[PDB]
Nucleic acid binder design. Structure first.
Ligand SMILES: O=P(O)(O)O[C@H]1[C@H](OP(=O)(O)O)[C@@H](OP(=O)(O)O)[C@H](OP(=O)(O)O)[C@@H](OP(=O)(O)O)[C@H]1OP(=O)(O)O
Lengths: 501, 536
DNA sequence: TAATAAACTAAAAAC
DNA sequence: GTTTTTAGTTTAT
């Protein structure tokens, strides 16, 4: 399926005002945030449809000719030209191009704005799954002076929830704070919340607005729904997710040289002598050892792999201190209860999560992902929910599925005679370590291979300027670190390296 | 490297007398030897294996001159193992009716290594003894045996029906390859206590205080890789330089500590009649994906990539020039941060690297030891840039200290890029108004976790004894594959055999943990309603 | 030379 | 059925 996401940006006067900030304007903050989603959907080959609509402008552009509503881009797949068009409204110069092309500061009515957005969902030729509208505004009471417009906005917002269209508010900073209880409390779509009324805080930085949109730019997608068996009779349903996944360079695609059209590829198998098609029952598997051939059927090469049925068999509970950090084998996964399959799984899941945290214990399981695969011991490490100052979920509540290696996966290296350093040498390295100290964040580094690969595709797809070279953010800032250390490098050298080295 | 191994098995009469419930020491040692020869055959190593049997009815060894070393048979001489050896282990070799001096059989085993490794290159020489220590023996050759083992540099290992400690389950649950029980220490005789002491003194002379670690039980040997311990091939090092800036360099050498093995041989798809590979051929055809399936020749296909909805032609030639190009091999430090800022749920890659100093470089060993202890004394780690060579894509990873009593090193694990993360928002379970468990439900889970505890705090010194160490159990898919490959070779008409029970016994927790949880699981089944949804 | 990682093919399962 | 992921090969640096 194809999810749909419409970016709705306010074009009022306050959107172009950096009201006492060391940061961009709320409009420039929204335009750059939309570009990042457009690019990130292309990095991951996402098939979602994106749209860009502005309201409050002097010029209008929509099917029903509703005033002060400009549809910049209808619902369609992102491209190089669509990203280049959004770049025309970036920064101070982009503020001038936007106001000269559409105007700003004009009046509006949120009822008419939501009618145009819902009309974009109906015009889709593709099949759609999720239909969501993302609103960017720093105005918490758009129609506190016009009850006729605020009442029609609440009725249209309620009609969207019944239709199946979600509305997420990306409220930006306002002098005195953004008050959601004034108006947008009866508009945003929510029902899963446990009557907590949490919601994200107001966005004052581009990084915060980006993470809040990134938390809703892509929906959940489970890697597999498996059975977590305490025994043979007590079985709950869990969902396996990959919160981390190595984003690789997209594979090439074969085209027709005279039309640049993609080409279908079909691979078949035939007998060499007769040329007839080979059924799966017309061939067998072979393995030669020395001068002897061992022939197995295709059904038997999979039968020797068969051990457990797909799922998680509970082995016991092991304290967290017995799980070594240097025993990493492959990227860990996330386990969350799947209430849609087995009713009552979340209650047992929560009780297991609560007691595993109090006792600092992990649930050892025998893990079988698919059918006909040997098992692997995994440790479900309890994981408590964590929110930051923006009420963004940095750590989701559940279990961290940590893969445990077998005895074969361990490899030994030769031992040294352990040469230790003196406290005078350790002290000099301590001062070097303290000089190059920084705050690490899991999203601080970008892939230089992936960035440069798509920078080359942009230069070929748009045919504008030559491909520039990306700045490798993984290379050390050599000149900055040398000045930062000073003479600490010549020191420690005299304490360790002899002049005859 | 290559190694020569001599398997010295006891087939005497006492090897067929066991305790009710557990198999005979003859059948236990017969499966440990089968496990060893199976991996040596199907991995197709260059290791040579000989088999000496003592306790047989007959006598066939090059030391029998003068009614000496009787009831000792050299069933297999030093050569590459084959299917004929495995078939003899599976069918031909029968238990004997006599009893032989197990030290005399060790002398015959030493005679095979001394006379048959004559010209061949062997980096290691090893002898493994499988006996129950139930028979009498002479102790005059004790100093002669140790002098020949040290002058010839021959390692030694022992495998007994019982563990070198004690047993608490009185004849109790006894399963081959299980966790916990391994023959009752109260069921051994005083002759076995005398022979075990001689085994200790021999291993202490050859290895030292760690010589006691080379005495295993047949049950625990089936769920470990101890039989291959003395003949494992050495790991390859990775030379590079750890750089802090541009004026500080430290020569280092990296090894892969964790790396998944998986299968070694590939299945070749062959014809069902000729059983040959050349009779099979695959042809991949190209055609227009859209309307009208028209074939395309290779002289009309170019390379392209997708940029969202755009299709961008990009030949491999133009791709080679505009490609990102790095300087190459490196291990450069970007900075240092608190270890708490690096959670293990962010670990990436399919390997773990241990970074030592360059071998025989004391100056580099002192420099790296300063970095290891500085990070440890500050509770900090190093964020570094790792690149295997000029071809591999550069990585961002973490290097945290690892201080032991015999060596110090840095442990490298790859860290994720920003493009690798996914911010899936999940519903709150702590602040849940729907799935919050009751007090009785939490007490049932609390009682279940205590009953299913896989650790034991013995002697009351916070010393946790792991009752189920999964990292010491071998991957069951290997010995399961070796079982089927050998079964098809020796029995082509019979179907594949089922999984051996000692494999299932090692893949399960101790029997005390399973029985302890029956009552807590029963209360959980009644307190937690569970039913499948069938409506949508 | 072997060691190994970037590429690539095939099959399972979610949507 | 289509799309993402992963075990299983493949083949060059
Ligand atoms: O009993 P554990 O708490 O699990 O200790 C293990 C075990 O060592 P010991 O049984 O000798 O105490 C490992 O031994 P093997 O897996 O090789 O049989 C050893 O591995 P090494 O032989 O590589 O040293 C490993 O040490 P490490 O994982 O650091 O290599 C060490 O764990 P600790 O380092 O926590 O003591």
């Amino acid at each position: 399926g194809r999810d749909s996401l419409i970016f709705l940006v306010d074009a009022s006067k306050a959107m172009f005002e950096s009201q006492s900030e060391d940061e961009l304007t709320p409009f420039d903050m929204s335009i750059q945030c939309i570009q990042s989603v457009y690019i990130s959907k292309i990095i991951s080959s996402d098939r979602d449809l994106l749209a860009v609509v502005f309201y409050g402008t002097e010029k209008d552009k929509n099917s029903v000719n509703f005033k002060n509503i400009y549809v910049l881009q209808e619902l369609d797949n992102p491209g190089a030209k669509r990203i280049l068009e959004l770049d025309q409204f970036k920064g101070q110069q982009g503020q001038k191009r936007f106001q000269d092309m559409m105007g700003h500061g004009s009046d509006y009515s949120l009822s008419e704005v939501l009618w145009v957005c819902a009309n974009l969902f109906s015009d889709v030729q593709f099949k759609m799954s999720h239909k969501r509208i993302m609103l960017f505004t720093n105005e918490d009471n758009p129609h506190g002076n016009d009850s006729a417009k605020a009442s029609r906005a609440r009725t249209k917002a309620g009609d969207l929830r019944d239709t199946g269209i979600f509305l997420d508010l990306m409220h930006l900073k306002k002098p005195g704070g953004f008050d959601i209880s004034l108006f947008y409390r009866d508009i945003i779509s929510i029902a899963e919340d446990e009557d907590l009324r949490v919601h994200f805080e107001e966005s004052s930085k581009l990084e915060d607005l980006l993470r809040k949109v990134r938390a809703k730019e892509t929906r959940k997608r489970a890697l597999s729904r498996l059975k977590l068996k305490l025994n043979k009779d007590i079985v709950i349903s869990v969902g396996i997710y990959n919160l981390v996944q190595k984003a690789l360079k997209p594979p090439p695609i074969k085209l027709y040289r005279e039309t640049n059209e993609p080409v279908k590829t079909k691979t078949r198998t035939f007998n060499t002598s007769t040329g007839g098609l080979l059924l799966p029952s017309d061939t067998k598997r072979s393995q030669i050892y020395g001068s002897r051939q061992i022939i197995l059927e295709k059904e038997e090469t999979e039968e020797l792999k068969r051990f457990d049925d797909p799922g998680l068999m509970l082995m016991g509970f092991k304290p967290l201190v017995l799980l070594k950090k240097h025993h990493y084998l492959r990227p860990s996964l996330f386990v969350y209860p799947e209430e849609s399959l087995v009713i009552g799984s979340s209650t047992l899941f929560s009780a297991l999560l609560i007691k595993c945290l109090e006792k600092e214990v992990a649930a050892l399981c025998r893990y079988t992902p698919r059918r006909n695969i040997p098992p692997y011991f995994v440790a479900l490490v309890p994981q408590e929910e964590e929110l930051d100052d923006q009420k963004i979920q940095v750590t989701p509540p559940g279990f961290q599925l940590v893969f445990l290696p077998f005895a074969d996966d361990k490899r030994k290296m030769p031992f040294t005679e352990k040469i230790m350093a003196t406290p005078e040498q350790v002290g000099k390295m301590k001062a070097i370590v303290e000089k190059l100290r920084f705050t690490y964040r899991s999203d601080s580094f970008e892939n230089p291979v992936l960035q440069q690969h798509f920078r080359n595709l942009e230069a070929l797809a748009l045919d504008l300027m030559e491909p520039e070279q990306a700045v490798d953010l993984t290379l050390p800032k050599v000149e900055a670190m040398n000045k930062r250390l000073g003479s600490l490098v010549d020191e420690f050298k005299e304490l360790v390296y002899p002049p005859d080295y | 490297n290559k190694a020569a191994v001599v398997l010295c098995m006891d087939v005497g009469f006492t090897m067929s007398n066991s305790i009710p419930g557990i198999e005979s020491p003859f059948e236990q040692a017969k499966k440990v030897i089968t496990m060893f020869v199976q991996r040596q055959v199907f991995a197709e190593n260059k290791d040579e294996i000989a088999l000496v049997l003592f306790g047989t009815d007959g006598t066939d060894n090059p030391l029998s001159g003068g009614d000496q070393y009787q009831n000792i048979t050299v069933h297999r001489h030093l050569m590459l193992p084959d299917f004929d050896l495995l078939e003899d282990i599976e069918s031909k070799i029968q238990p004997g009716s006599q009893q032989a001096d197990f030290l005399d059989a060790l002398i015959v085993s030493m005679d095979v290594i001394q006379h048959e490794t004559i010209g061949k290159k062997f980096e290691k020489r090893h002898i493994e003894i499988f006996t129950d220590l139930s028979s009498r023996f002479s102790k005059s050759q004790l100093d002669i045996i140790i002098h020949s083992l040290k002058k010839c540099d021959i390692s030694l290992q022992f495998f007994l029906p019982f563990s070198l400690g004690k047993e608490d389950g009185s004849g109790g649950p006894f399963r081959l390859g299980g966790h916990g029980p391994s023959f009752p220490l109260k069921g051994i005789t005083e002759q076995q206590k005398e022979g075990l002491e001689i085994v200790k003194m021999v291993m202490i002379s050859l290895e030292g205080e760690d010589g006691l670690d080379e005495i295993y039980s047949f049950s625990e040997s089936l769920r470990k890789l101890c039989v291959f311990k003395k003949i494992e091939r050495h790991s390859i090092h990775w030379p590079c330089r750890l750089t802090i800036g541009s004026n500080l360099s430290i020569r280092i050498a990296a090894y892969k500590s964790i790396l998944q093995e998986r299968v070694k041989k590939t299945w070749t798809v062959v014809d069902a009649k000729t059983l040959k590979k050349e009779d099979i051929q695959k042809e991949t055809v190209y055609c227009l994906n859209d309307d009208d399936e028209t074939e395309v020749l290779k002289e009309d296909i170019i390379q392209g990539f997708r940029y969202g909805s755009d299709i961008v032609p990009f030949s491999k030639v133009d791709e080679e020039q505009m490609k990102y190009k790095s300087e190459g091999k490196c291990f450069s430090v970007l900075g240092f941060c608190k270890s708490s800022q690096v959670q293990r749920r962010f670990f990436m890659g399919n390997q773990v690297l241990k970074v030592f100093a360059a071998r025989d470089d004391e100056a580099a060993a002192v420099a790296l030891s300063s970095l290891i202890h500085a990070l440890d004394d500050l509770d900090m780690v190093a964020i570094v840039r790792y690149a295997y060579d000029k071809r591999a894509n550069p990585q961002v990873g973490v290097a945290f200290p690892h201080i032991k009593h015999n060596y110090e090193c840095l442990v490298y694990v790859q860290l994720p890029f920003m493009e690798d993360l996914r911010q899936y928002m999940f519903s709150s379970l702590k602040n849940s108004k729907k799935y919050a468990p009751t007090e009785a439900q939490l007490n049932a889970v609390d009682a279940l976790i205590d009953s299913m505890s896989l650790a034991k705090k013995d002697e009351k010194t916070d010393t946790l004894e792991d009752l189920f160490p999964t990292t010491k159990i071998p991957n069951p898919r290997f010995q399961r594959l070796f079982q089927c490959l050998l079964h098809r070779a020796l029995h082509p008409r019979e179907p594949l055999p089922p999984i051996q029970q000692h494999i299932w016994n090692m893949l399960n927790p101790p029997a005390e943990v399973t029985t302890k949880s029956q009552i807590p699981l029963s209360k959980i089944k009644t307190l937690f309603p569970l039913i499948e949804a069938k409506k949508k």
